[PDB]
Amino acid sequence: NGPEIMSKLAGESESNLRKAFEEAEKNAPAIIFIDELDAIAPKREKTHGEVERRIVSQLLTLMDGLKQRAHVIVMAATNRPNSIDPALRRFGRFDREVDIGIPDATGRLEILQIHTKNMKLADDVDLEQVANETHGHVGADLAALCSEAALQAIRKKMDLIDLAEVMNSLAVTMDDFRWALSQSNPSALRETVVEVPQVTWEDIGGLEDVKRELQELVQYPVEHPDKFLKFGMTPSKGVLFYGPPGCGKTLLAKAIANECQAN
Amino acid sequence: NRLIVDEAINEDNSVVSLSQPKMDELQLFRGDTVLLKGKKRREAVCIVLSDDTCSDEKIRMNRVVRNNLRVRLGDVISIQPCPDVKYGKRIHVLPIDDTVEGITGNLFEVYLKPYFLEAYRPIRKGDIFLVHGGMRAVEFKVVETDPSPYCIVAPDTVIHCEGEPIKREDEEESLNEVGYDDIGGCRKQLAQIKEMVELPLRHPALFKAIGVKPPRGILLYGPPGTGKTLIARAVANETGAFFFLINGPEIMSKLAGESESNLRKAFEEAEKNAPAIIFIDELDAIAPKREKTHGEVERRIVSQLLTLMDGLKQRAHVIVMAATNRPNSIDPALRRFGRFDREVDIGIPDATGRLEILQIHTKNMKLADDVDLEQVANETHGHVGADLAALCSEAALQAIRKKMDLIDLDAEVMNSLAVTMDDFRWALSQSNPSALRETVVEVPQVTWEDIGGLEDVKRELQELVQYPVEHPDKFLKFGMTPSKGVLFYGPPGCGKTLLAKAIANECQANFISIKGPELLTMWFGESEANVREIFDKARQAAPCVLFFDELDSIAKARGGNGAADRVINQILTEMDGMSTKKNVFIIGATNRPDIIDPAILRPGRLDQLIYIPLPDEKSRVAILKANLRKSPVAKDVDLEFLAKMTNGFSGADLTEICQRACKLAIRESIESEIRRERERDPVPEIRRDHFEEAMRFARRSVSDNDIRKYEMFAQTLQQSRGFGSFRFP
Ligand SMILES: Nc1ncnc2c1ncn2[C@@H]1O[C@H](COP(=O)(O)OP(=O)(O)O)[C@@H](O)[C@H]1O
Ligand SMILES: Nc1ncnc2c1ncn2[C@@H]1O[C@H](COP(=O)(O)OP(=O)(O)O)[C@@H](O)[C@H]1O
Ligand SMILES: Nc1ncnc2c1ncn2[C@@H]1O[C@H](COP(=O)(O)OP(=O)(O)O)[C@@H](O)[C@H]1O
């Protein structure tokens, strides 16, 4: 972990950072993970001090110290891309960039079966409409929700003599789940959702010509790439929507991305 | 000694072919001790005069000195007599590639002794040659150095057996072969690099004809992510100087006191070695701008580095190179003209740079005979060499993803790889352009007949910008300096961009284009130094055409909420400060001409206000020929009737007509495909019904009263003509 290196004194920051890198000299199939590297390598002008620059410089030096010798893999935990300074994440040197985002309703559902496959539910909850709601919720908060549900399963039992009467058969209800949700709070709120929503296109009727150019626009740049390249012109970059302020909040573009299985 | 080479015959260095009439022409000494030279400063000694299999004037060398000292077969082989060397005592027991493939045993009796005919290895103590008994593919690096120079050894004395295997990475780790061809098309500035390093290139003799060397110190300027390690290593193994690269964070990692260690020691050994070229990788970490710097150890480190720069004795042509992301990122004290004065710009690669950047990385593969690589090149607009390297990497990764997990290594996909055009196009979609939002310094493609216009109107521009570049004596005999800038105006001027691009096409000069929102970004960001940096890099991008699109964007922005502004005053500052030479030319586009600046019509700045009218029926044939190019429109189309129907449309409107006809054609083609699939040859020919229905999507975007406004502006262009044409003598 990065704060292990940060917690040591000056001069000992070289210790427990290179030491894993010659420990990876022993093991040819190996990976190297640094947790919370935003505290390790933030913006250089943001830091007030010199030891942070020492740690950043020695990490950049030991990045290419194993130049395809042991073929080790470096992965890291970044809260934001702009937290990392652009000098460290330049191309060719620690630059492969994928993301995680937030899980969808099916992802929250699978998180719920993962966290409930060990415990014993009271097999009466639906456990699907619950995951369909809780928008902007981390799965860690879903684990906390399950923990609060088990805490309510303890709590509805009175002060007994500490024997497995309720402990052997944990009883959870949907109202218990809702009240544990009520005594909770989201932390993934006010973030841009990247998941595709569904309205399944039947809810909008009429405007069939508008449906015809909407199926013209986005349905087949990747569905018909070579057929669109018969003429050679580019697809239309932008479309502007105008009209009365009525039935115009959302979900039309969500539907027209939902036939394309697009985010 | 400069002569052509023969092809390979055998696979042993202990037998070498011979050309005896060419040795009759030349002077070469006996047998085992003959020097051959060439690339990477590598002197090598082996046998000649032994086989005589081939003909005259071409001689076979061994394959391990075919790949070393040259690039491939058909090169220029050179010979040199290097006789009267001493006798060594049992060079290497230690091989370096394939010890574990087999048994060790006595570690030198096993492979050297069945494979020699009294050729006692006069090779460099550290050089390679494949030698084994049965499998015959074991290299070596020599650790036994009983003779110092290139010497044969005595027959069969005794040594130790400390040979241990290492992975075969040392030759491309320390003596990695790079040449002029090994950088993907940087010959705009690679020629400048070769000009700058030619006086360091083993030449003290012209130093008295040069006075001081113009390379006191060279700065490489390039985008973050283009890489400069192999670019700085190009002069290594082509000059033979001691490279000794040191990284910036490598210096910053060690503590103070030790920070001066291996920093001034590098320069101290740089006077110890007579050929020396020094390179600093990412000196911006060492030397930023001083306002971003903090503390005392960083200032002391940059002070030590600057005393190393000023402590140059100007001896033995010791040159320092550096890796700059931006010239403004480094400290401005280093740009003084006593050291680190000469700046050379790598820049971003163009479409042809993307074209011949790719064969170097795709040497070690096999195409599926379908990629022409022109359809890989210009679709990656705003990419860089790291983008193409990662593109090839994850294209091969996608090809491996197509392969199922059925591996015996078998050798059905890895030996013969099938990265298709679909694989490269899927790779090209999943890209990450680090060179996005970087202005291109390159020559575009319009080539003068995309739009017709009036050719004499463009011909005064042809006289204005092309002929001062072509003829330096154009205005020297009888005249003075021509116009620095010409701005066009009137309608939405996409065709003005085409004219500026074709003007850049004729001169093969650079085309830097600045957009209206690009200037509004500096207008609302309150950072006026960006325009100065743009003009400063345009000075080094000479010759170039500076295009500003929508100069009245600031006028339209201030109309929503004084005509002079902060960004146009910096424009007037640089362009009044622009020299009377260097052929930097300005092209302006403006929708509303009279409202932007009363001071822009003053002479000294610019005087030409060449207006172009709305495109008419003569240029509609040219725009429809542009429709004919790159698009399979069929015959029986009445372009004269189309130009009859375009009463007042624009060129952008007629390209929109092309787009609506494209939309009709592609939607009816996929509808024909859908009913063909529903029934249980895409017909690319396009008929008159496409244009007949696309004509219903045609409205004059330009205002009809605005043409009256344009001729009211041209009433100012209407002069004070009248009587007075009296006499020409
Ligand atoms: N189904 C739709 N989805 C998204 N935007 C729409 C839809 N229908 C109309 N619009 C656009 O939205 C605008 C009006 O939105 P409005 O009705 O004010 O939003 P709300 O429904 O939140 O009141 C119109 O200009 C129209 O072009
Ligand atoms: N202009 C170029 N020509 C050839 N290769 C390039 C170019 N730019 C980048 N590369 C490739 O990018 C990779 C990493 O670049 P880096 O090692 O940072 O410096 P350099 O670009 O000088 O090699 C190298 O493998 C190199 O081949
Ligand atoms: N004479 C012409 N007038 C206008 N557009 C033309 C002409 N000839 C070709 N074109 C094409 O029309 C396109 C216009 O698109 P563009 O100007 O990029 O849109 P925008 O102004 O919104 O950026 C250009 O890509 C160009 O290739």
UniProtKB/Swiss-Prot annotation, chain B:
Q: Which residues bind ATP 2?
A: G493, C494, G495, K496, T497, L498
> What taxonomic lineage is listed for the species of origin?
Eukaryota, Metazoa, Chordata, Craniata, Vertebrata
The UniProt entry, under Gene3D superfamilies, shows: 1.10.8.60, 2.40.40.20, 3.10.330.10, 6.10.20.150, P-loop containing nucleotide triphosphate hydrolases (3.40.50.300)
Tell me how this protein assembles. Homohexamer. Forms a ring-shaped particle of 12.5 nm diameter, that displays 6-fold radial symmetry. Part of a ternary complex containing STX5A, NSFL1C and VCP. NSFL1C forms a homotrimer that binds to one end of a VCP homohexamer. The complex binds to membranes enriched in phosphatidylethanolamine-containing lipids and promotes Golgi membrane fusion. Binds to a heterodimer of NPLOC4 and UFD1, binding to this heterodimer inhibits Golgi-membrane fusion. Interaction with VCIP135 leads to dissociation of the complex via ATP hydrolysis by VCP.
Which UniProt keywords are listed? Acetylation, Amyotrophic lateral sclerosis, ATP-binding, Autophagy, Charcot-Marie-Tooth disease, Cytoplasm, Disease variant, DNA damage, DNA repair, Endoplasmic reticulum, Hydrolase, Isopeptide bond, Lipid-binding, Methylation, Neurodegeneration, Neuropathy, Nucleotide-binding, Nucleus, Phosphoprotein, Transport, Ubl conjugation, Ubl conjugation pathway
Protein name, entry field: Transitional endoplasmic reticulum ATPase
How is the protein modified post-translationally, according to the record?
A: Phosphorylated by tyrosine kinases in response to T-cell antigen receptor activation. Phosphorylated in mitotic cells. ISGylated.
N6,N6,N6-trimethyllysine, modified sites? K292
* Consequence when changing H160W: Severely reduced binding to DERL1
Result, substituting E162K: In CMT2Y; normal ATPase activity; impaired autophagic function
Which residues get modified to N6-acetyllysine?
K474, K477, K635, K709
Listed result of changing E550Q: Does not inhibit interaction with RHBDD1. Increased interaction with CAV1 and UBXN6. Impaired autophagic function. Defect in ubiquitin-dependent protein degradation by the proteasome
Reaction it catalyzes = ATP + H2O = ADP + phosphate + H(+)
Documented effect of changing F108R: Severely reduced binding to DERL1
Q: GO CC: one term? A: ATPase complex
* InterPro entries assigned: AAA+_ATPase, AAA_ATPase_CDC48, AAA_ATPase_domain, AAA_lid_3, Asp_de-COase-like_dom_sf, ATPase_AAA_core, ATPase_AAA_CS, Cdc48_dom2
Residue positions where Phosphoserine is found in the record: S14, S434, S669, S725
Q: Where is ATP 1 annotated to bind?
A: P224, G225, T226, G227, K228, T229, L230, N325, H361
Phenotypic consequence of R63A: Strongly increased affinity for ATP. Strongly reduced affinity for ADP
Disease annotated for this entry:
Inclusion body myopathy with early-onset Paget disease with or without frontotemporal dementia 1: An autosomal dominant disease characterized by disabling muscle weakness clinically resembling to limb girdle muscular dystrophy, osteolytic bone lesions consistent with Paget disease, and premature frontotemporal dementia. Clinical features show incomplete penetrance. Frontotemporal dementia and/or amyotrophic lateral sclerosis 6: A neurodegenerative disorder characterized by frontotemporal dementia and/or amyotrophic lateral sclerosis in affected individuals. There is high intrafamilial variation. Frontotemporal dementia (FTD) is characterized by frontal and temporal lobe atrophy associated with neuronal loss, gliosis, and dementia. Patients exhibit progressive changes in social, behavioral, and/or language function.
Consequence of substituting A209E: In IBMPFD1; increased ATPase activity; no defect in ubiquitin-dependent protein degradation by the proteasome; impaired autophagic function; defect in maturation of ubiquitin-containing autophagosomes; decreased interaction with CAV1 and UBXN6
Protein purpose: Necessary for the fragmentation of Golgi stacks during mitosis and for their reassembly after mitosis. Involved in the formation of the transitional endoplasmic reticulum (tER). The transfer of membranes from the endoplasmic reticulum to the Golgi apparatus occurs via 50-70 nm transition vesicles which derive from part-rough, part-smooth transitional elements of the endoplasmic reticulum (tER). Vesicle budding from the tER is an ATP-dependent process.
The GO terms this record gives for MF are:
ADP binding; ATP binding; ATP hydrolysis activity; BAT3 complex binding; deubiquitinase activator activity; identical protein binding; K48-linked polyubiquitin modification-dependent protein binding; lipid binding
Q: What result is annotated for mutating T293A?
A: Does not affect methylation by VCPKMT
Q: Which PROSITE patterns match?
A: AAA (PS00674)
The record gives the effect of mutating I346T as:
In IBMPFD1; uncertain significance
Similarity comment text for this entry? Belongs to the AAA ATPase family.
